[PDB]
């Protein structure tokens, strides 16, 4: 049967995904669970971080959403770093997102930013304490991923930061 909290959690995942700010804020004032997740552990923070919705990210954070939540794969910081959302990365970090969290493959966000050729995000990560020596389950490093991905500029930055 239908339950209040679950339905509001559903609505919240939906709205956070869709980028609907008004809906998200309203759902906040109605007590929707900021930490609701789907079958795969996807939280509203994950969705917003990934689909580039900055307002919604800040709102969820201020309402206490778990910055370091793992879903089936990773943390919100991973998603934002992989998707090339610089500001979301900065906010996430400002709110205590772990710069070195490792996903189910042992990727850190530095791994993903380097793989995806996002340089400015690589710099923000480094400046925030990212470890260049982090090794994924393939024994691969962020420098490794940058080189493997045609990212040589990013590689130079990483090499200089070691």
């Amino acid at each position: 049967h239908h339950h209040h909290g679950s339905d509001l959690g559903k609505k919240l995942l939906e709205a956070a995904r869709a980028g609907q700010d008004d809906e998200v804020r309203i759902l906040m004032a109605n007590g929707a669970d900021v930490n609701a997740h789907d079958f795969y552990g996807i939280t509203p923070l994950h969705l917003a971080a990934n689909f580039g919705h900055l307002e919604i990210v800040e709102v969820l954070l201020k309402h206490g959403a778990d910055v370091n939540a793992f879903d089936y794969d990773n943390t919100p910081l991973h998603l934002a770093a992989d998707a090339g959302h610089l500001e979301i990365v900065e906010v996430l970090l400002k709110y205590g997102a772990d710069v070195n969290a490792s996903d189910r493959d042992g990727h850190t966000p530095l791994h993903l930013a380097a793989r995806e050729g996002h340089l400015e995000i690589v710099e923000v990560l480094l400046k925030n304490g990212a470890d260049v020596n982090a090794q994924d389950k393939f024994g691969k490093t962020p420098f490794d991923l940058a080189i493997d991905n045609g990212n040589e500029d990013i590689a130079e930055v990483l090499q200089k930061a070691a």
Partner: peptide, 16 residues
């Protein structure tokens, strides 16, 4: 379900 979702669909909602 992740195997069934396409490559760019990995973030859709699964509620079951």
């Amino acid at each position: 379900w992740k195997d069934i979702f396409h490559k760019n669909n990995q973030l859709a909602l699964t509620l079951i």
